[PDB]
Amino acid sequence: SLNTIDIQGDILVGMHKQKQLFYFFAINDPATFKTHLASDIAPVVASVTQLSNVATQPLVALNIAFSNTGLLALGVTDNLGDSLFANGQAKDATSFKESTSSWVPQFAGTGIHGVIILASDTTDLIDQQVASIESTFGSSISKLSSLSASIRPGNEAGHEMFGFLDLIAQPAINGFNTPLPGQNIVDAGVIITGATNDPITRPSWAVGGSFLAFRQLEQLVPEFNKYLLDNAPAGSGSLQARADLLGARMVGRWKSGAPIDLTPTADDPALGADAQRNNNFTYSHAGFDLGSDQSHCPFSAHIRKTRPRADLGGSLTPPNLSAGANSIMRSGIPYGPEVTSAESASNTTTQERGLAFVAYQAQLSQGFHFLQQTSADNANFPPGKTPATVGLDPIIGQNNGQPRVVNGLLPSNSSASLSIPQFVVSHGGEYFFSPPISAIGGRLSA
Ligand code: HEM
């Protein structure tokens, strides 16, 4: 059975707070650090059970995860069963056709030992917790870098910086979640190390944890907006409506959350808002060839790249259950200032904003790394299409800084190709292990 009292809350349900801070640290003195890990951190680590009850939301929700070098620092030399985690994300950068030369320097190495995720409805409360941690740990912990993040304001709450409603679609864990129409249903061990049908043997103390892939992804919002206007397909509606259609073709959903597969020519804001309906699709349509039909949703659309559904086989009617092992739980949150008037007017980014991307999975090679390398960056994925060259994911696909060729986006002609500049720019990140809560004051403090 899944022991959710022992699982850190961000993994399965998110922090449920307006503000987050990602505090990236080194461990200078493992003896003193361990003492305070047990006494000061472990008691305030928020569990899935705690965060799932409206009566037990803490003022500051706190989670903590460790990199490979952070575990080594703590004298933990165990094999957690994940080569990508052990090697660190910087060594993995080439797999995604990017260079660490573009990264925040602190990420371009393995000096980061962990991340504390602090979440609260105000930054003042976060800052107070940080001050407390720095006081009680002294120099045994040291801040290397940090990133502040926030839910976006007003009617954009829950939307990412490009304006799209986010975190709609997640895997349902069999026995834990009540599945929604269309939602994939997966074994707990796809997300939680050592849980049901995780095929990789783990250290005993690590059962109930998950690997956290962190990415600092800058978004070029004015540039994206202008691109859509400049490349809007011809049609009867306003120019902006036609630009909106192109954006929806790139993401696979309208900004409202309505999936284009179910409403291919216009938004349906009521559909987007309804969790019982907004995921109820497989990409299959009777009387259309799945291998060639891009009239409902392009093969290159972001969500189709990241959850192929019927493109990888399985049921043509909902729920499609394909590629469960390639599922990730997402807890990303936007960062940076809102787009200013001047930036919008000049169509030019002058301040850094984007997504503090957080993905959880039990195997990095099957989750984040797979989705980036085998799908988003792969012009021939999904397989079996006609024509075969799908092109890259227009949102996250990478090709060493060059414009991405993306096919199928234009409804009038599925063979029409666009060469699209990057609108998402990686500043790097790291792979961490979020341990079960018992390990925090247990093995890791021993
Ligand atoms: C700044 C970068 C990104 C932006 C703006 C973005 C935006 C979005 C949006 C708007 C959706 C639709 C909402 C939803 O279906 O929940 C979505 C879905 C999703 N994204 Fe991204 N995303 C980004 C990065 C990534 C990365 C790096 C990955 C993985 C390598 C990823 C994986 C997914 C997955 C798995 C889904 C759900 C697919 C499904 O289950 O149908 N995203 N994203």
Author numbering: 3 to 448
The authors write:
DyPs (dye-decolorizing peroxidases) (EC 1.11.1.19) represent a new family of haem peroxidases widespread in bacteria, archaea, fungi and other micro-organisms. In the present study, we expressed A. auricula-judae DyP in E. coli, solved the crystal structure of the recombinant enzyme and several site-directed variants, and used PELE (Protein Energy Landscape Exploration) to describe the binding of its typical substrate RB19. The DyP structure is formed by two domains, each of them including an antiparallel four-stranded large β-sheet and two or three helices resulting in a ferredoxin-like fold (plus two additional β-strands). In spite of the obvious similarity between the two domains, only the C-terminal domain harbours a haem cofactor.
Near the confluence of the two domains, a channel provides access to the haem cofactor that, due to its location in DyPs, connects to the top of the haem. H2O2 will enter through this channel to activate the enzyme, forming compound I. However, direct oxidation of typical DyP substrates, such as RB19 and other bulky dyes, by the activated haem is not possible due to the narrow opening of the channel. A possibility suggested by favourable RB19 docking by PELE is low-turnover oxidation at the DyP haem channel. Since the haem-access channel was also identified as a possible RB19-binding site, the G169L variant was also obtained, whose leucine side chain completely blocks the haem-access channel, as shown in the crystal structure of a variant including the G169L mutation, compared with the WT DyP. However, the disappearance of the low-turnover site in the G169L variant (inset) suggests that this site involves the haem-access channel (although a decrease of the maximal turnover was also observed).
